[PDB]
Amino acid sequence: VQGPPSPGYYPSSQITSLGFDQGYTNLWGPQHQRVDQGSLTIWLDSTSGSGFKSINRYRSGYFGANIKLQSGYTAGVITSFYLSNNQDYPGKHDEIDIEFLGTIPGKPYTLQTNVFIEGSGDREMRIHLWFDPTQDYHNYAIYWTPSEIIFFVDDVPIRRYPRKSDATFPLRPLWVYGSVWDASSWATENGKYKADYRYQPFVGKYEDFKLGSCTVEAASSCNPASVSPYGQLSQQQVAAMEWVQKNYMVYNYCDDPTRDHTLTPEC
Template structure:
């Protein structure tokens, strides 16, 4: 049985029995969902299947809080099947993964005077919307709405995390350290793996770290968009 809910009519479709959901974008509306809980540190995984075909100008995002963007190129077609996108956030670092492969790490460098997310609790969000004013070649390529509706699919959301409620964490200092993710760091081989991200693929993945990355300034995470007609990199 399917249940539809959204701020935009039925642009969100959830198949409760299969733990599968879809977000749909039309010319006059996008859609999104968020986790029920706020978190302060955790490992969050979700499988996504991105919008197929010519969806240039639309953006599918999966994020938490935010400052700037970094662009990477995936080694597979993210529209052909589900792939696992993960965010690891602990007191030592924030690491983004795709199918278990680390693609970016932000270390805690507070000792050097660089701010770090130690006290800002966040929810997990995902959304799809029209961003053809900036996402495709700086707004030069506009969304072809004859191809709509644009649908991205999601499943298997999993949060191994410290739930933050009323200023209190569900993780005490003792039980948090029992979770492998709480102290997980990248070893040299993992860092090398992330550095070897190919630059020849056609599908872009962008990591967001700020309010300039998306005009409305959503929280840190990943978003995927096609760079132009046929997913060509500008």
């Protein structure tokens, strides 16, 4: 295993790799978190998962990490990296998600991306990957400006969510989070395979954090990082994103005939 065509531009290579403590602290389950020379390990077992949160609240930016997932049986468990304001607006929040959905032997991990606006999501896109995300660290990133969201895997854009209306786009400040947790009811084949704690702990590893971003109170000149040679995805970037969605996309909410698309007019 064919990988995508080169995107011709490498946003992750233009931003300094950071240790955990330069951007983040633990939020819950500190007993299931360790940091070794900037590299983070968090884990889930029968008693608790763990999650971390950025020190700052942001208005925009480029947010990335190198992440490595657990091999073997991992059904029902989600390893995550996301932007959210759920703690500022409980129940009525915005979120931008990367979620790895655990799996069973013989079947690949699923990477889900999602967007919540004022408390409602249902904006899922799911892909499988062109590499084994348990064998080494791979780069995952969320780019977020007032005009668009772009998700990147190893600097390949896998999805773009443009601003079609204010009501369907995240315009309020977000913090960065990451977690490992039990989503047995839905994560793996819509809940068919659930967490099996015989295989515990379920470990998530994160390092070389990337922040090319703008805090809420940052000087007004602050804007995110270039994500393309131009002011917009290049045709080479677009072609790579197209290949991913052609060859690896397994769900797109816009294409689901069971979904009421009026509830999501950005489609």
